[PDB]
Amino acid sequence: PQITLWKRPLVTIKIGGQLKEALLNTGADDTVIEDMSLPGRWKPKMIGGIGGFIKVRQYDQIIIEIAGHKAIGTVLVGPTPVNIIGRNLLTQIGATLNF
C-alpha cells in the first residue's frame, strides 16, 4: 500500500498468535510492543526517546506479520504507550519513505 500521513500510520499486526494495532514508525530504530509473553530467552535493554528511557525485554528471532507481511527480527517488550514497528522490521517488508 501507499500510506498517506494525514493520520497516524496504524496497521494490524500478528505477534505471538495475538492481533494488535501498531504504529509504523520511521523514527524508531527498534520495534517495541506493549508488555506480553513471547517464546524463548530474553535480555534486559534500555531504550529512550522523548521523556527519557524505559526498561524493556529483548527477544530475538521473533516473527511478526505486519499488515499481512511476514517479518522476523528483534522485538522489544515493555511499557510502551503505543505498539511500535521500527526500522529493523520495516526494512524487511520493503518499506520506503517517498516524496
Ligand X SMILES: CCCC[C@H](NC(=O)[C@H](C)NC(=O)[C@H](CCC(=O)O)NC(=O)[C@H](Cc1ccccc1)NC[C@H](CC(C)C)NC(=O)[C@@H](NC(=O)[C@@H](N)CCCNC(N)=[NH2+])C(C)C)C(N)=O
Interacting residues toward ligand X by CB under 6 A: 23, 25, 27-30, 32, 46-50, 80-82, 84, 86
Rounded to a whole number of angstroms, the minimum distance from the CB of residue 53 to ligand X is: 7
Helix (H/G/I), strand (E/B), else coil: 17: coil
Helix (H/G/I), strand (E/B), else coil: 40: coil
Q: Which of residues 4-33 bind a copy of itself (CB under 8 A)?
A: 4-9, 23-29, 32
> According to CB under 8 A, which one of 57, 69, 73, 74 is a site residue for a copy of itself?
69
Whole-angstrom CA distances from 8 to 2, 14, 29, 58, 80 are 13, 19, 18, 26, 16
